[PDB]
Design an enzyme around this catalytic site. Structure first.
Site, PDB file in Angstrom:
ATOM      1  N   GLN A 192      34.868  43.951  33.145  1.00 29.15           N
ATOM      2  CA  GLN A 192      35.961  43.166  32.594  1.00 29.15           C
ATOM      3  C   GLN A 192      37.279  43.523  33.259  1.00 29.15           C
ATOM      4  O   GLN A 192      37.563  44.696  33.517  1.00 29.15           O
ATOM      5  CB  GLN A 192      36.130  43.408  31.101  1.00 29.15           C
ATOM      6  CG  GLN A 192      34.932  43.098  30.291  1.00 29.15           C
ATOM      7  CD  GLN A 192      34.614  41.630  30.274  1.00 29.15           C
ATOM      8  OE1 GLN A 192      35.407  40.798  30.728  1.00 29.15           O
ATOM      9  NE2 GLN A 192      33.439  41.296  29.768  1.00 29.15           N
ATOM     10  N   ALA A 207      27.244  34.306  28.473  1.00 27.89           N
ATOM     11  CA  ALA A 207      27.599  34.690  27.117  1.00 27.89           C
ATOM     12  C   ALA A 207      29.107  34.682  26.929  1.00 27.89           C
ATOM     13  O   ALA A 207      29.876  35.062  27.819  1.00 27.89           O
ATOM     14  CB  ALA A 207      27.081  36.082  26.770  1.00 27.89           C
ATOM     15  N   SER A 256      29.237  33.073  31.539  1.00 29.32           N
ATOM     16  CA  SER A 256      29.112  33.386  32.935  1.00 29.32           C
ATOM     17  C   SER A 256      28.289  32.349  33.756  1.00 29.32           C
ATOM     18  O   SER A 256      28.227  32.462  34.945  1.00 29.32           O
ATOM     19  CB  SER A 256      28.489  34.749  33.126  1.00 29.32           C
ATOM     20  OG  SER A 256      29.473  35.728  32.680  1.00 29.32           O
TER      21      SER A 256
END
Ligand SMILES: NCCN[C@H]1CC[C@H](CC2=N[C@H]3Cc4cccc(C(=O)O)c4O[B@@-]3(O)O2)CC1
Ligand SMILES: [Cl-]
Ligand SMILES: [Cl-]
Ligand SMILES: [Cl-]
Ligand code: NA
Ligand SMILES: [Zn+2]
Ligand SMILES: [Zn+2]
Length: 358
Positions: free
Chosen positions: A117, A315, A61
């Site tokens: 997501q 991550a 990110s």
């Protein structure tokens, strides 16, 4: 490097690597505007290939900082305004819940609960439209921040529409190339694959898997040298000769919303400096960073404050990245690792180093 930098880096990062079982790590410390590079361990364990200054890591990110700056550059070009409705750029988004959701809301995670997501089932353009057409908001726009790939990811996809370029081409032409980030990629070319580190998760070598809006939300790969140059560029935007990009960098560090002591930029997040280290360390834990919290609007957005701690965690399944910098002090750090280890450990180590050097 100066002995004080070598000393603090050894005493902070080598134990971190020991404590967290990180196979390979690259660190750049920017001190008085200049990067000093450090590497440890392996980019590929089984091949015994070391981490070097040319090793590519998945930024996760931290990619959102590129998306935010590209969006700022589009603002500075007059191509978009953050007050514009989403439907100006995607007219097929005819479902009524989109009335009142602006580009600002998408860019800053404030549309009203878009999910972390995009579902893995979204594989085609029609799937993506269906997903957004059927999404039901949990909150009114502009009231709650819920960190989300499906929010800033859509922002990046729409922000490039007026240019006529794909997101990747826009990023390459308008950000990577002007900044001479010649080893930074959304899609790693075949001839650069030899430098692409493996990520490690539960002992298995992994790379990020494709997904909808991945380029915008989490899909950039880069080297420690290119990431140091990214930090330099965000520390000192006036050094950038391309005016729209200089301004886009500045706009991504403007303060659009406040929650507690944290301010939301475009991709970047900011706190006033001097910072309470426990707030950045603890706030980085995913239990908090991923939670919904109320925001107060800042109108007009505060122009970029040089006395700020500006940062972003990233991550993927196999990688953990962190970038932080303090424009007023000409001081920054990039930490790229091929294990996704807990955010608070990253921020604590970064704080210890930068605090020792101010
Ligand atoms: N453009 C929206 C028109 N009003 C409609 C008003 C009812 C609402 C059902 C609903 N869903 C949640 C999320 C949400 C979204 C926007 C406004 C509100 C609000 O309470 O005002 C809101 O609050 B909720 O608890 O209520 C559906 C939209
Ligand atoms: Cl020691
Ligand atoms: Cl690319
Ligand atoms: Cl992943
Ligand atoms: Na992609
Ligand atoms: Zn030691
Ligand atoms: Zn050791």
């Amino acid at each position: 490097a100066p002995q004080q930098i070598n000393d603090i880096v050894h005493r902070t990062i080598t134990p971190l690597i020991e404590q967290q079982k990180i196979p390979g790590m690259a660190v750049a410390v920017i001190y008085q505007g200049k990067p000093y590079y450090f590497t440890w361990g392996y980019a590929d364990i089984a091949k015994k290939q070391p981490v070097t200054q040319q090793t590519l890591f998945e930024l996760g990110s931290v990619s959102k900082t590129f998306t935010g700056v590209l969006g700022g550059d589009a603002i500075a070009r007059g191509e978009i305004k953050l007050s514009d409705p989403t439907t100006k750029y995607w007219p097929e988004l005819t479902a009524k819940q989109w009335n009142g959701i602006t580009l600002l809301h998408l860019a800053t995670y404030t549309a009203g609960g878009l999910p972390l997501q995009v579902p893995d089932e979204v594989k085609s353009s029609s799937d993506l439209l269906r997903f957004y057409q059927n999404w039901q908001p949990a909150w009114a726009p502009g009231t709650q921040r819920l960190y989300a790939n499906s929010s800033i990811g859509l922002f990046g996809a729409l922000a490039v529409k007026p240019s006529g370029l794909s997101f990747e081409q826009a990023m390459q032409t308008r950000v990577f190339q002007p900044l001479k980030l010649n080893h930074t990629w959304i899609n790693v070319p075949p001839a650069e694959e030899k430098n692409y580190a493996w990520g490690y998760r539960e002992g298995k070598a992994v790379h990020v898997s494709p997904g909808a809006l991945d380029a915008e939300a989490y899909g950039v790969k880069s080297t420690i040298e290119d990431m140091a140059r990214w930090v330099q560029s965000n520390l000192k935007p006036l050094d950038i000769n391309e005016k729209t990009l200089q301004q886009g960098i500045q706009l991504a560090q403007s303060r659009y919303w406040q929650t507690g002591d944290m301010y939301q930029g475009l991709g970047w997040e900011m706190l006033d400096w001097p910072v309470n280290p426990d707030s950045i360390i603890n706030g980085s834990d995913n239990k908090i960073a991923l939670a919904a919290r109320p925001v107060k609007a800042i109108t007009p957005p505060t122009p970029a404050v040089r006395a700020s701690w500006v940062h972003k965690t990233g991550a993927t399944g196999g990688f953990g990245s962190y970038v932080a910098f303090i424009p007023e002090k000409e001081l920054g750090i990039v930490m790229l690792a091929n294990k996704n280890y807990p955010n608070p450990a990253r921020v604590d180590a970064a704080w210890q180093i930068l605090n020792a050097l101010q």
